[PDB]
Design a protein around this ligand. Sequence first.
Ligand SMILES: CC(C)c1nn([C@@H]2O[C@H](COS(=O)(=O)NC(=O)[C@@H](N)Cc3ccc(O)cc3)[C@@H](O)[C@H]2O)c2ncnc(N)c12
Ligand SMILES: CC(C)c1nn([C@@H]2O[C@H](COS(=O)(=O)NC(=O)[C@@H](N)Cc3ccc(O)cc3)[C@@H](O)[C@H]2O)c2ncnc(N)c12
Ligand SMILES: [Cl-]
Ligand SMILES: [Cl-]
Ligand code: NA
Ligand code: NA
Ligand code: NA
Ligand code: NA
Lengths: 348, 349
Amino acid sequence: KAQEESKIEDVDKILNDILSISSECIQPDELRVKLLLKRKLICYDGFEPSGRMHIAQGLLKSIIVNKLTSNGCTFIFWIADWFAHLNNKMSGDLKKIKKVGSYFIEVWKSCGMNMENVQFLWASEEINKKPNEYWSLVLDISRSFNINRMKRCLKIMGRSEGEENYCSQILYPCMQCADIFFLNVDICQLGIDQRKVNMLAREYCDIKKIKKKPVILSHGMLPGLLEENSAIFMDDSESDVNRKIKKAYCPPNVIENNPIYAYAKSIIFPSYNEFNLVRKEKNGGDKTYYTLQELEHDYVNGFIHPLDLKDNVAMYINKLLQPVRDHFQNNIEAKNLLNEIKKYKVTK
Amino acid sequence: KAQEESKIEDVDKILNDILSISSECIQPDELRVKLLLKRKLICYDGFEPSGRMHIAQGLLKSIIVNKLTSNGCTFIFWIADWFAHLNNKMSGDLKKIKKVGSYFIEVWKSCGMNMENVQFLWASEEINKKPNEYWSLVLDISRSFNINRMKRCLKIMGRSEGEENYCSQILYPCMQCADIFFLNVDICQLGIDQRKVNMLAREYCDIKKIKKKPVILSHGMLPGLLEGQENSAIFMDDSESDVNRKIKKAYCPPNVIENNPIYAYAKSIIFPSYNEFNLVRKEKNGGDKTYYTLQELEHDYVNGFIHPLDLKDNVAMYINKLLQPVRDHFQNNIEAKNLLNEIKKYKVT
Ligand SMILES: CC(C)c1nn([C@@H]2O[C@H](COS(=O)(=O)NC(=O)[C@@H](N)Cc3ccc(O)cc3)[C@@H](O)[C@H]2O)c2ncnc(N)c12
Ligand SMILES: CC(C)c1nn([C@@H]2O[C@H](COS(=O)(=O)NC(=O)[C@@H](N)Cc3ccc(O)cc3)[C@@H](O)[C@H]2O)c2ncnc(N)c12
Ligand SMILES: [Cl-]
Ligand SMILES: [Cl-]
Ligand code: NA
Ligand code: NA
Ligand code: NA
Ligand code: NA
């Protein structure tokens, strides 16, 4: 027959693709086993509703999510409303956190996630449907690890250790760890800045002799726009994008920590399977890049000047944000929601 | 007009009465104010179902609760089953913890308390009836205090600082603090070893601008039977000979009251149980005598008018009389006898 061989090849391809969009996988052979389970894998990422959405959580997220769901997975977006509250976001105000969460969902559905295999789940709603199960997990995790081990998860709250260490910094990682089991996740697909608590979950499996362990499929962090005006938001207008890109950090010849180059490589190139650099002839002229290898060689050797990369990145970000811009300009309810949340003060 | 004066006098009597069963009150002025509210005050104590019941948690508790419920209070016994589990009691085993909690309730119902204003509430059951309210309190408390402040509450878990500090030692005090608000308590009536988390609740009110603050009415810790404190305390299932053997060997310094745990039993359990202490002695040792005030009893023993061994002999027989109706419940009620049999087989962790 040879169908067996064809299925092995199919699995190898799905595995190479799933691994492609990741900066790290813990562990690849485990991911291969999960796939042979012959079933939809559950992936998830989670989000504090803390203010307008940075393009990392919309444009970049949509690329990874569509890759995974098109390869048979279901993807949960965990709107971590209680976590934002625990982390002092939006003045702790749950009404504001809820409005922001609603705005997140509007963004995601207009930026490539209006689809059957993506679920938008609210942490508070889901915890309160099964609160004995949820909080019993949280308490059992807290019994298994000492305070220092848990303090090492502080990066998941976006915090440095030099500040005051509130007890919330213990509860939050216990709860994020519980989420991984509570949602029956196969793949934790969060930014690499979440790795500590994802590793904690794997350690908890070993402690409890739980053989079903989650695969950590972490994506890379987009560097900050600068080395409000500090990030591109998913709702930004064309002039807002143009202005923020013009002033962004884009060191000549340097890719490390370069946000402009990161947008080209991680958002724009996968979206178009190319990068078209429009330039005057005296600056090298237009050029179409078909590989990231050439783009990197050309930027590192100075063939691409920062101003040219910036102009092209701005044009592409505006093209990619068009359906979001249009949704929030033309849909009256979404326009009114954005107008409300834009007035909120951003806290921590 | 004569009614106004009489209302004041009544409150003063009730205040001094409630305060008598306490070793510390934070604060008496606040308790007076609570007493003027013209509604029942909610009091509570909570208990990890962890093994045998200490005589302090059965006989002494019933003396205190009877005082409070006859003085305008309602009293909650909080069966802290999830806390026992969090604190690694009974192998963490929630089935054993539930069995032991059932046994505690059986004991308390035979301990001589007026039950019309007493409730037995299970932590897990009540929390899961209102889990959004409860866990939102827990998280807000955790946002309000730093880790070091919460580590200083470790005594409430019966643990020493030299050991490994599991994160459960942070969740537990946040949760005990939450209980105080979740149950809408007016008076936290626990042992003085719970003071840190009770102080935490008060501080939390100040932080949140909550003017309704709980009064901490702490009772004293009953000392261990041996000098400087199994054989270190009476438990609620102990037999008459168990009591006799443990009291007989207890520390009872002749002519000295301080740290004499026998005297601690006379003063905190027996005297409030009988509104007196009737000291039986042979005529050659002074003959029987009734002390009607603790000042009187203390005066006679500190000056050597009371033989230590006479205090032991009576403390033991009075403790035996007091445990009799629990013994009877567990001999004659068949389901109770078997519950006690099962829970005595548990390994204490
Ligand atoms: C803009 C910056 C903040 C950023 N975030 N992310 C990624 O977005 C996601 C959200 O982030 S978050 O809202 O801050 N939430 C958190 O941290 C979590 N604890 C919330 C949570 C998660 C799971 C739970 O079970 C419970 C709670 C993460 O996967 C970040 O790793 C990026 N990815 C690439 N480049 C970037 N610059 C960024
Ligand atoms: C056994 C001995 C040490 C002792 N205990 N108690 C007193 O009994 C009670 C139980 O104690 S416990 O079962 O250990 N539970 C705990 O500690 C709590 N954290 C459980 C809890 C409570 C309220 C909550 O909202 C949540 C959880 C306390 O009031 C002790 O203070 C004594 N009173 C006088 N003399 C004594 N020798 C003793
Ligand atoms: Cl449940
Ligand atoms: Cl509720
Ligand atoms: Na969907
Ligand atoms: Na974060
Ligand atoms: Na050109
Ligand atoms: Na204790």
